[PDB]
Amino acid sequence: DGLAGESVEFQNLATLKPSNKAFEKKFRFDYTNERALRRTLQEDLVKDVLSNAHIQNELEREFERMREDREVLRVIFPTGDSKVVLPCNLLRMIWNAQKIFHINPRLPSDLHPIKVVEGVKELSKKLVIVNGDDPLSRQAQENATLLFNIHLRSTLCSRRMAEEFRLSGEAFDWLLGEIESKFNQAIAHPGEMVGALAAQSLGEPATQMTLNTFHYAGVSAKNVTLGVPRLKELINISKKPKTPSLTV
Amino acid sequence: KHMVDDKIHSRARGPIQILNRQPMEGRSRDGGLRFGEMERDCQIAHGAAQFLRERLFEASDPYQVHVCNLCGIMAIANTRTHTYECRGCRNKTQISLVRMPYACKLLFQELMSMSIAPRMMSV
Amino acid sequence: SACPLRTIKRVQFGVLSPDELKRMSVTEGGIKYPETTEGGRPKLGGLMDPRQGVIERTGRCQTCAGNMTECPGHFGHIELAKPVFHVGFLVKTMKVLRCVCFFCSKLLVDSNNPKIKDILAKSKGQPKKRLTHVYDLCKGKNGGCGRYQPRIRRSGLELYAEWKKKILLSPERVHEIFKRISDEECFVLGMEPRYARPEWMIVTVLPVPPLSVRPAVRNQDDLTHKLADIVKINNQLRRNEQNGAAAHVIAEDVKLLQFHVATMVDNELPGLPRAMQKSGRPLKSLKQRLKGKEGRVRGNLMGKRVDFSARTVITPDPNLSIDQVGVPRSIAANMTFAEIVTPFNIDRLQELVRRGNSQYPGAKYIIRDNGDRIDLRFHPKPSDLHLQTGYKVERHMCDGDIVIFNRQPTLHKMSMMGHRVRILPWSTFRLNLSVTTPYNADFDGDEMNLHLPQSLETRAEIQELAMVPRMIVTPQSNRPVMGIVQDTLTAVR
Amino acid sequence: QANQKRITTPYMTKYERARVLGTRALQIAMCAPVMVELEGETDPLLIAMKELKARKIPIIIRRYLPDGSYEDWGVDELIISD
Amino acid sequence: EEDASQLIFPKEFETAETLLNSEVHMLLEHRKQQNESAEDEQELSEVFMKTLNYTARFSRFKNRETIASVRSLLLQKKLHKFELACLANLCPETAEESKALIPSLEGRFEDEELQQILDDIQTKRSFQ
Amino acid sequence: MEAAAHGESDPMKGVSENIMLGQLAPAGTGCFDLLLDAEKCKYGMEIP
Amino acid sequence: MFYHISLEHEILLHPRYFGPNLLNTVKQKLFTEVEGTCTGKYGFVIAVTTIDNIGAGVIQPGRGFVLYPVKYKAIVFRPFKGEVVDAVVTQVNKVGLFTEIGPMSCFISRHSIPSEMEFDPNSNPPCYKTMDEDIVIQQDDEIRLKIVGTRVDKNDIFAIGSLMDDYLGLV
DNA sequence: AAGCTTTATTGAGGCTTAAGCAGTGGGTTCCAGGTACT
DNA sequence: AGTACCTAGCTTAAGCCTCAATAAAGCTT
RNA sequence: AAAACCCAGGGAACCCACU
Ligand SMILES: [Mg+2]
Ligand SMILES: [Zn+2]
Ligand SMILES: [Zn+2]
Ligand SMILES: [Zn+2]
């Protein structure tokens, strides 16, 4: 991905592990309801969304991308877990933005949801891992930030922005700048000794992790062998491992 | 028995070994600390290439040797009369000066003693 | 000094040509005397040769004008009577002997072959893989001369040919048969004749390293004793074949000479008796000097002793920042930083110079513009203590200086940090508490190493990279490594 | 390669900044002219950091592409990391 | 190894370009003039004014226009730069003298044409 | 020896070649080279 | 022969001498350090015509100065083997003949001087002349000499002339 | 002559052997002995 | 007699030993 | 006799400690 290992944090993918109805209930941003729009947005913005159908079409299109993203994540993560490392802690910065701008989220918010969709799309263009314009670089850029963009859309969708976050227009503008600035700081620096860093990153834990933590049974019948010798058998390709095994 | 005055020692360009122009060993002979292999690896990981060069060459054993440009073997140089000739080649004009540690010069020397030519080309 | 300063872009490894070795040698007549010195003075042509290098301090080289420090040493050569193959290249020699025709000295593989052209097409730049393909291809032939494959077996060290008659095979026989392989013929086997030629693998002239390699302290080196055996036996062969020609003393002394030169390179021959000295200690050969963990590559080139370093026990101290280390005064009064004289600090540095050494904040070395050092601990005349812009002052380290602070074993990159120097009275390294966790040093008698970056440029390199605030978060597990020590943690809870 | 084909990262990464600071403080310590108006300092490293914040270091950095090519970025042209 | 009598030159002086005594004289005089101006500059080397006086004493073409005429006259004949420069500097008067001073001119040009070239040189030689 | 027997070369593009040869390795803070600007030196004033 | 070639040399600039005008300092450095010098390969460095190219300034790692590769047109002269060159006689000796070609001192020994061209110290100027007193080579004369060989010592070249071949001697 | 049989034949499975095996200080002992010749 | 001169396991490639298809060679009907 | 001791020219093996 081209991201250095210092400026990343454990984050939770909200798009992963809802039900289909739960996913739609939490992300679709149903614009048909009157009172919900009245409570969340200011009245000038409420009639703007209700009157125009182009905005409604765009809000439907971004949800289409989320279902596409939801399928992609489930293919990437067959296991039902979402604890993944990503550079920008989006939830914290949103919470950071809330306290900076004194949201008072009881009042209806005042940012146009079309600004959220347009701001996210512009932000995704600004986050560049691979330069160039040819489709080979475009695919690499898409694949480099595929996971981050899915998480970026999920946390900064129109429904959660107007319902559970309720940032302001200036706060959202600050949020986009902060995310862009922090993502550029997490880019791997050309010239980092990754090989030396990775080698120490594996050998340092090798001292702490026991030579024979597997003296005990481990799996009741199997002798897992996990330990320095198991690490050794992987570092040098041993054609005669101490305990070969299968998982049928 | 492990008191601190028996263990404290510092050094700045103290006595230098005779086999290779490196610092002594042990504080009894005013020896210096050894910047071992893992220390070199850690300074690579830090990316502090200039500090690594300083430690391993400038602060340990700086040395210079004259090598002719054609053949990668060290030549003979009279710095008093400024005569720089490579016996075997006799070029006397295409000869270069390099700054390389005395340990590396020694190593190349017994490599030549093994009939091996570490021909250094500066071009 | 007239030679331009250059950097080594590439180094090419090849065997020394015997003709090349002779001409580069400084011992023109060759080492013909087993003696070390003659009547208290170095004997020309002996083991210690004045042309070879500088013998003692306050002396000059006879080849160059070296002062025992600027003299790199000059090689000599030993024209031994009968050619000898030496160890190491023997395994490669045997493979070459298999590939080449024993009698016709031909490639034995008929390079006019699409199989070999396929191999050459595959082998563009890999010499060892090219030689492998051919060795497997060589198999068995007897192909052109007829009955020309003698199985070449190696008994002990000496290798002997054996048809299905067995005869011990002379090293000079190897030299004669490698003389015939052509240039492109060598390129098929993966040796460039411009750099490596098979006939050069047989050592027909032995290089003796200069005095810089083997030292003398009156007392001779272990390598010197072995070279004494080489020239003692070499002179024996030279006189035996000069007039004796017994054809049997030669048959044994050549083997004895072969053993000695072989052991000089590699001591631990697996099946051959280790060489011995009069003291009873096995002699350290050149290969033994390099292969060990205490050898040259690892023990001297990779990890070496360094000046400007201190080592003492650490004691905890919570009254200073995490980037500050409390070094003792005596260490600070013995460790110097080279500060450049500029008009900004010319007055401050002048104040340090007049203090001199043993006046803690002062200095001990002052360097002129031409690299001339003047000591300050011996009180020279005040006339040369003047300072102008351009001088160097090696002043004792003061507060705020940057040091590298590491603990063996250095496992990860947080085992070696840069700290700011604080001067405290007692004779220990006072460092902060949260720095313990990355170091794994629990003050139970642990002693620490402190390195000082001597140049100004490397000082900024550490300050922008190796300061402890800049590696609070690890890259291995994207989490902080400093943390809070136990006593603060329990008290804050 | 011209400025149209200038593909390296516009940000001054930490190794480049660390070496620029060292090589500029070394020059300042050797009586090089100072690019920025100093308010009175003796440590040349602080002067180099001040120049870094002023983006007035008279150094062009040559970034070697792994293929053999190289780009020439100005210090003022590079975006400072901090 | 080198011999200009049959035009054997080292590989280094293959792209070299020759100059006249008068061309060198005028170039050195211009450089001396710029040395007179552009203050805070020390005097030039001993070789500088040594060669300047050497080429001023042996100057044969007092005019830069004469220099241009000699070049436009001599370049279009098949002459090597060394032969052309030596002919224009030594200024022989007889074809035998020109062939003896420069033995690499044997058969390059007809002796009548060579004598005509020498007569042209003498015509454009700035007399004193 | 095997490199010497095969006449091998070494581009020294790695790290430890420069380390043992004592020259600066291309391992970060040294992966690049620095060029002194000509124009920016004109804009700087001389300190007293 | 007086040659106009392009030569490459590296100039070293300390930061103390950077100044507001940097390239003029490099020009002065080049105009000082190669002028009047002599190389065994290219001969006498007579003058630098025009500084052609100034290369990129590579700051030496660790050490302070910057490095400038410089290409420049230069007027040079190198003596050859086998050419007749005009010369000015500086001294006539019983052993040889001291002649001058620009900055180069040339020694024409008498054994390489024909038998007719004899030495006479009886004349007020010690000079070379024949018995017919037709060719008189004395102090401050304009002659032509046949360069046989050149020797370089202490970074300058001196040569040996001869008068064996025809049309050699006083002009 | 197409097929069977033999016989090298040639690539493909089984046995010994080097060669490596984390970092810095402090003390002790030993480095010729044996003959030979005055 | 004193002294100077001579003489504990490991692993893995790697070379080495043996064994079964197979086409050339010559019989075979 | 700059007697600028600007302050070691010994190595090897073994054992014992500390992390
Ligand atoms: Mg401890
Ligand atoms: Zn040479
Ligand atoms: Zn020497
Ligand atoms: Zn044959």
In sequence order, what DSSP letters do the residues of C159-214 get, joined into one string?
EEEE---EEEPPHHHHHHHHTS--HHHHHHHT--TTT--HHHHEESSEEEP-TTTS
Continuous segment of H or E residues that includes residue G87: strand G84-92
Which residues from chain F sit within 8 angstroms of residue C13, using beta carbons?
3-4, 7-10
Q: Which residue has the tokens 């040079």?
A: G76
What 8-state DSSP symbol labels residue G111?
G
Angstrom distances, CA of residue B65 to CA of C148, D26, G91: 50, 26, 45
Give, as ranges, the nucleotides of chain J with any atom within 7 Å of a protein CB: 6-13, 17-19
Q: Which residues contact E118 (CB under 8 A, 6 or more apart)?
A: E87, E92, E93, E94, E95, E98
Per the annotation, binding residues of C for Mg(2+) are 442, 444, 446
Which residues from chain G sit within 8 angstroms of residue D72, using beta carbons?
56
The structure tokens listed for B78 are 């009279």
Distance J1 C1' – C374 CA (angstroms): 23
Q: Which residues contact C444 (CB under 8 A, 6 or more apart)?
A: none
Q: Are residues G3 and G74 in the same domain?
A: yes
Instruction: Give ∠ CA C180-C185-C186 in degrees, rounded to 5.
Output: 90
Q: Confirm or reject contact between F48 and chain D (CB < 8 A).
A: no
Cα D34 to chain centroid, rounded: 14
Counted domains in chain E: 1
Q: Are residues G9 and G86 in the same domain?
A: no
Give chain C residues 257-286 with Cβ within 7 A of strand J: 279, 281
Which residues from chain B sit within 8 angstroms of residue C301, using beta carbons?
101, 103-104, 107
- Contact yes or no for G15 and D62 at CB 8 A: no
Distance I9 C1' – B38 CA (angstroms): 27
Of A16, A17, A48, A40, nearest to A159 (Cα)?
A40
State the maximum Cα–Cα separation within chain F, in Å, rounded to a whole number: 62
Which phi and psi (to 5°) does residue G98 adopt?
Answer: -90, 110
Q: Are residues G97 and G153 in the same domain?
A: yes
What is the C-alpha to C-alpha distance for residues D50 and D46, in angstroms, rounded to an integer?
6
Q: Are residues G67 and G147 in the same domain?
A: no
> What residue of G is the nearest CA neighbor of E17?
G4
B71: annotated binding-site residue?
Answer: yes
Q: Which residues contact C210 (CB under 8 A, 6 or more apart)?
A: B109, C52, C53, C72, C73, C74, C75, C76
Cβ–Cβ < 8 Å for E114, E95: yes
Q: What ranges do the domains of chain D cover?
A: 1-82
DSSP string for E20-66: -HHHHHHHHHHHHHHHHSSSS-----HHHHHHHHHHHHT-----HHH
Angstrom distances, CA of residue G129 to CA of C10, G119, G143, G146, G168: 63, 6, 13, 18, 13
- Alpha carbon of C243 to ligand 1 centroid (Å): 72
Q: Which residue has the tokens 């070449």?
A: C152
**Among partner residues B54, B58, B93, which is closest to G40 by beta-carbon distance?**
B93
What is the C-alpha to C-alpha distance for residues C430 and C435, in angstroms, rounded to an integer?
11
Q: Are residues G116 and G147 in the same domain?
A: yes
What 8-state DSSP symbol labels residue C10?
E
* Sign of the alpha-carbon torsion through E76, E80, E83, E89: positive
Q: How far apart are the first and last CA of chain A?
A: 33
SS3 for A117? helix
Cβ–Cβ < 8 Å for D18, D45: no
Burial of D2 (0-12, 13-18, 19+ CB in 10 A): exposed
What 8-state DSSP symbol labels residue G24?
H
Of B41, B35, B72, B29, nearest to B56 (Cα)?
B35
Among candidate residues G55, G80, G105, the one where a domain is terminated? G80
What is the C-alpha to C-alpha distance for residues G51 and A85, in angstroms, rounded to an integer?
58
The structure tokens listed for A79 are 């296991």
Distance H11 C1' – C229 CA (angstroms): 49
SS3 for A233? helix
Q: Confirm or reject contact between D58 and chain B (CB < 8 A).
A: no
- Contact yes or no for D18 and C460 at CB 8 A: yes
Q: Confirm or reject contact between D6 and chain B (CB < 8 A).
A: no
Among candidate residues G80, G98, G117, the one where a domain is terminated? G80
The structure tokens listed for E25 are 């004289």
Nucleotide nearest to A242 (CA to C1'): I10
Q: Confirm or reject contact between G154 and chain C (CB < 8 A).
A: no
Q: Which residue has the tokens 């043993």?
A: C358
Among candidate residues G25, G51, G80, the one where a domain is terminated? G80
B68: annotated binding-site residue?
Answer: yes
Nucleotide nearest to B31 (CA to C1'): H25
- Alpha carbon of A132 to ligand 2 centroid (Å): 49
Amino acid at site C461: E
What is the C-alpha to C-alpha distance for residues G108 and G164, in angstroms, rounded to an integer?
11
Q: Which residues contact A134 (CB under 8 A, 6 or more apart)?
A: none
- Virtual CA dihedral for C333, C336, C340, C344, nearest 10 degrees? -30
Burial of G147 (0-12, 13-18, 19+ CB in 10 A): buried
Chains E and D touch (3+ CB pairs under 8 A): no
Q: Which residues contact A44 (CB under 8 A, 6 or more apart)?
A: none
Which residues from chain E sit within 8 angstroms of residue G79, using beta carbons?
none
The structure tokens listed for C284 are 């350290």
Q: Which residues contact E36 (CB under 8 A, 6 or more apart)?
A: none
What is the C-alpha to C-alpha distance for residues B83 and G40, in angstroms, rounded to an integer?
13
Continuous segment of H or E residues that includes residue D26: helix D14-29
Strands laid side by side in the C363-367 sheet: C336-340, C392-396, C363-367, C373-375
- Contact yes or no for A6 and C476 at CB 8 A: no
Cα C385 to chain centroid, rounded: 40
User: Which domain covers residue E16, as residue numbers?
Assistant: 1-128
Q: Looking at the CA of B121, name the nearest ligand.
A: 2
Q: Which residues contact C132 (CB under 8 A, 6 or more apart)?
A: none
Burial of C458 (0-12, 13-18, 19+ CB in 10 A): buried
- Contact yes or no for F1 and B116 at CB 8 A: yes
What is the C-alpha to C-alpha distance for residues B45 and B50, in angstroms, rounded to an integer?
13
Q: Are residues G66 and G91 in the same domain?
A: no
User: Which domain covers residue G48, as residue numbers?
Assistant: 1-80
Continuous segment of H or E residues that includes residue G120: strand G118-120
Angstrom distances, CA of residue C337 to CA of C198, C344, C464, D28, E43: 53, 17, 19, 17, 42
Question: What is chain G's percent helix, strand, coil content, to nearest 5?
Answer: 10, 50, 40
Q: Are residues G76 and G109 in the same domain?
A: no
β strands within C255-388, DSSP E:
304-306, 309-316, 324-327, 336-340, 363-367, 373-375
- Contact yes or no for G46 and E48 at CB 8 A: yes
Q: Confirm or reject contact between B51 and chain D (CB < 8 A).
A: no
**Among partner residues B2, B84, B110, which is closest to C289 by beta-carbon distance?**
B110
SS3 for C222? helix
Which phi and psi (to 5°) does residue C331 adopt?
Answer: -65, -45
Q: Looking at the CA of C66, name the nearest ligand.
A: 3
Amino acid at site C273: P
Q: Which residues contact C258 (CB under 8 A, 6 or more apart)?
A: C84, C85, C157, C158, C171
Q: Are residues G105 and G160 in the same domain?
A: yes
Phi-psi region of A39 (alpha: psi -120 to 50; beta: other; left: phi over 0): alpha
Per the annotation, binding residues of C for Zn(2+) are 61, 64, 71, 74, 101, 104, 142, 145
Q: Are residues G167 and G85 in the same domain?
A: yes
What is the C-alpha to C-alpha distance for residues D24 and D47, in angstroms, rounded to an integer?
9
Q: Which residues contact E120 (CB under 8 A, 6 or more apart)?
A: E73
Cβ–Cβ < 8 Å for B102, B61: yes
What 8-state DSSP symbol labels residue G60?
P
- Contact yes or no for B47 and D22 at CB 8 A: no
SS3 for C239? helix
Exp. method? cryo-EM
Angstrom distances, CA of residue C171 to CA of C79, C107, C242, C283: 15, 20, 19, 25
- Paired with F45 in beta bridges are D34
Q: Which residues contact B30 (CB under 8 A, 6 or more apart)?
A: B9, B11, B14, B15, B24
Q: Are residues G88 and G147 in the same domain?
A: yes
DSSP string for chain B: ---STTT-EEESS--B-SSSS-B-SSGGGT--EEE-HHHHHHHHHHT-HHHHHIIIIITT---EEEEESSSSSB-EEETTTTEEE-TTT--SSSEEEEE--HHHHHHHHHHHHTTEEEEEE--
Amino acid at site C134: V
Strand H proximal to C218 Cβ, under 7 A: no
DSSP string for C406-439: E-SS--SGGGEEEEEEEE-SSSSEEE-STTHHHH
- Alpha carbon of C203 to ligand 3 centroid (Å): 25
The structure tokens listed for C442 are 């629990």
Cβ–Cβ < 8 Å for G3, E13: yes
What is the C-alpha to C-alpha distance for residues C288 and B112, in angstroms, rounded to an integer?
16
Residue E73: count other Cβ atoms within 10 Å of its Cβ. 15
What 8-state DSSP symbol labels residue A18?
-
Q: Are residues G85 and G169 in the same domain?
A: yes
Nucleotide nearest to C135 (CA to C1'): I15
What is the C-alpha to C-alpha distance for residues E89 and E81, in angstroms, rounded to an integer?
12
Continuous segment of H or E residues that includes residue C395: strand C392-396
Enter the resolution in angstroms: 3.6
The structure tokens listed for E120 are 């042209």
Distance I17 C1' – C151 CA (angstroms): 15
**Would strands C429-431 and C309-316 be described as parallel, antiparallel, or unpaired?**
parallel
Residue C22: count other Cβ atoms within 10 Å of its Cβ. 17
Which residues from chain D sit within 8 angstroms of residue A185, using beta carbons?
81
Counted domains in chain G: 2
Q: Confirm or reject contact between E7 and chain G (CB < 8 A).
A: no
